[PDB]
Design a protein around this ligand. Structure first.
Ligand SMILES: Nc1ncnc2c1ncn2[C@@H]1O[C@H](CSCC[C@H](N)C(=O)O)[C@@H](O)[C@H]1O
Length: 293
């Protein structure tokens, strides 16, 4: 076990700082998860209203209980942020004052769902954040063409040197059934000196690659970012926390190139030294923010 047992919102102070919840602002929490950031916003601003969404019904159950004392000011929905625009319309809301995105994995997803998001223990290769979707990590690992697995591991895992060998070992280990089977494949692909050289556990990037693919995380982010600015009232703030270089690059470029947004963070805001050790889920976190102009 590496991740903390306690669920802690990443960079909550910086989120509050850039989102500026105050007065009676309406805030869209695009990845409400267990409600960590939303609870902090509601505690910080007595007049704000939050529309919180997620695709994982199980974490929404947790958020609904955690946010119980603020139930009159926060509402939760099971919907992809890609459809947040129409969700808001069905609620009679055309624009919001703040948009928050935390692109990681929740504590409960890592430790209690038994979906194989991580490898602290032997679990099925599922990795679906929305259990209603059909594609599982197992199906991807056992059926995708080897060249596509290589592409995924290179692009989403950022394995810039060993992507092809990892894909080869995955194919050689078929059929894979558990998280330990995937760890075995990655271990066989990397030389002992390479495993020892790495800071993070050697299977980290490959697990992340498959997760992103299964949950269309990169495609979803790119599509949402194209029009997120249209959901903001003048002066509105959009804050995004990513845990992947490619996602961060996409956010940075979107904010910079946008003619409707003024980037507020030319350089990414990163977690304090203490936070990282206290909250492993904060590892690799990069926060960017922009304002509607
Ligand atoms: N397309 C999408 N739309 C909405 N939520 C999504 C999504 N893709 C992933 N998610 C959700 O994004 C969350 C990232 S973890 C977010 C943690 C939350 N900020 C907290 O403090 O509790 C997960 O719950 C995941 O299910």
């Amino acid at each position: 076990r590496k991740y903390s047992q306690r669920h802690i919102p990443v960079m909550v102070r910086e989120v509050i700082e850039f989102l500026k919840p105050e007065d009676e602002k309406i805030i869209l929490d695009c990845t409400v998860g267990e409600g960590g950031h939303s609870r902090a916003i509601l505690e910080h601003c007595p007049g704000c209203r939050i529309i919180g969404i997620d695709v994982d019904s199980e974490v929404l159950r947790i958020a609904e209980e955690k946010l119980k004392e603020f139930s009159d000011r926060v509402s939760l929905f099971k919907v992809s942020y890609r459809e947040a625009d129409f969700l808001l319309k069905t609620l009679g809301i055309e624009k919001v004052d703040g948009i928050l995105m935390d692109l990681g994995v929740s504590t409960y997803q890592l430790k209690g769902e038994n979906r194989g998001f991580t490898f602290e223990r032997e679990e099925p290769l599922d990795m679906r954040m929305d259990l209603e979707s059909e594609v599982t990590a197992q199906k991807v690992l056992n059926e995708l063409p080897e060249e596509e697995l290589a592409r995924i591991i290179f692009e989403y895992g950022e394995e810039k040197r060993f992507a092809r060998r990892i894909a080869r070992k995955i194919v050689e280990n078929r059929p894979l059934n558990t998280t330990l089977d995937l760890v075995k494949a990655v271990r066989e692909a990397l030389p002992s000196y390479e495993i020892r050289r790495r800071k993070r556990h050697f299977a980290t990037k490959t697990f992340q690659a498959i997760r992103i693919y299964v949950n269309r995380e990169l495609e979803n982010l790119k599509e949402f970012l194209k029009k997120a600015e249209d959901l903001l009232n003048p002066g509105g703030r959009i804050v995004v926390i990513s845990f992947h270089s490619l996602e961060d690059r996409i956010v940075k470029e979107t904010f910079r190139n946008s003619k409707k947004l003024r980037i507020l963070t030319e350089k990414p805001v990163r977690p304090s030294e203490e936070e990282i050790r206290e909250n492993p889920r904060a590892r690799s976190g990069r926060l960017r923010a922009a304002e509607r102009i």
